[model samples]
Target: MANERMNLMNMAKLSIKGLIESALNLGRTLDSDYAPLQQFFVVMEHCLKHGLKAKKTFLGQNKSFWGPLELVEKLVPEAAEITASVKDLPGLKTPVGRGRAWLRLALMQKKLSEYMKALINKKELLSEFYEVNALMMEEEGAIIAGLLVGLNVIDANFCMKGEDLDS
Candidate 1:
């Protein structure tokens, strides 16, 4: 096998880094307008706290583990509410409207966060899912932050930044 198992030290280092990064993410401003993002982070961090290391896969590989939706709902009730609120907001009646970009971003975040939240509910967090979420969080968080800054929903100084969300 070309891939040797990762050593404990390396895993430990990653875990520590994940903790530090998650902490920094928490330190970001907590404006009421960004409540969904904050709530999503809470659920995400909880999953990372209890999940396992990332796994590897090849081109032909199809096997993957998904965290149970029921388990996540059981573990983090807030996530479900946030997901619902983001999806059910009055302004989101149609995909196109005033502030549609922000609405689109929030809805996208809700979808992915909900998916990843369920996927991370298992005894161990799947590494591939973590990888997927890392990208989603970066792109989504940046979009949300930029919109906050550009649309005056939040001041430039208060804009939320992306985080390293996996361990």
Candidate 2:
């Protein structure tokens, strides 16, 4: 489990590094189609999914980062707007998709790091969704959250209205 956490932390490092450099080179405005930007989101998804406990549902055992992400609304009232927007996104039919959309919305607001820090600080809450050795349960989670602060310098504009976020 520590091995998995190390790998995901490294990936997150590279993803955030590459995204920052590319966004700077591109004059700091990133759209949804940017490859590095897209990769950043994918890397973040993997980070959030690491060491998630399987949640038993009516359909079967399932895992989705959205459950943990929803806690942001409770921890930081400002996050409620993004949570509402993700929930209202028309084509997002799955919790995973909602999670992804939440990441994007947070980045666009330049508050991804703030929201992440708020969520990661509450280990009592995160322990419910993540294993004890999970990335989000240890120091690496704080490091990743700190790295996200660099993204505030970049302006990300995502048009969620016509986007296909479910894929």
Candidate 3:
């Protein structure tokens, strides 16, 4: 589990670094089609999934990082806007979809780092969804959260109204 944390942390570092460098080179507002931006979100999803406890559902078992992301609204009042937006978004039929939309919205707002920091600081609350060795409950989560600060310098614009985030 600790090794998984280490690997995800390294991946987050590379994804964030690559996104920043390529975003700077492009010198344009990034859209959902941007490769680096998409990769960054995938990497973030992996990071969040590390050591997640499976939730027993009618489908048997499910693991999604959305539950923890929802806590951000309670920790940071500004995050409530994004949470509401994600919920109101059409075609998002799953919690995973909402989580992805939430990430994109937070990035567009340039508050991803601030919101992640707020979430990571609440370990007691995160324990409900994540294992004791989960990334969100450890130091690597903080490092990744700090790395997200660089993303604030890059402007991203996503048109979620017609986008297919469910996939």
Structural similarity to truth (TM-score) of each candidate: 0.23, 0.90, 0.90
- RMSD of model 1, in Å? 15.2
Please report how far candidate 3 places residue 143 from its true position, in Å: 0.8
Worst 10 residues of 2 by lDDT: 54-63
* Candidate 3, residue 157: lDDT: 93
Residue 158 CA displacement from its true place in model 2, Å? 1.1
Clashing pairs in 2: none
lDDT (tens digit, per residue) of candidate 3 on 1-167: 57878988998998999999999989999899998999999999988888688784567535388878888899888899999998777788788888999999999989999999987888888888888888888999999998899999999998876656777
**Per-prediction backbone clash count:** 3, 0, 0
If the candidates were sorted by their lDDT against the true structure, best first, what order would they fall in?
3, 2, 1
Tens-place lDDT per residue, model 2, 25-99, is 789567888988999999899899886887746676363888889889998877999999988778888889888
Which candidate number maximizes lDDT? 3
Tens digit of per-residue lDDT, candidate 1, span 81-139: 53344344554443222122232333334343333334433424334344433322233
**Runs with alpha carbons beyond 4 Å of true place in candidate 3:** 56-63, 162-167
lDDT of 1 at 122: 41
Q: Which stretches of candidate 1 lie over 4 Å from their true place?
A: 1-75, 93-118, 121-167
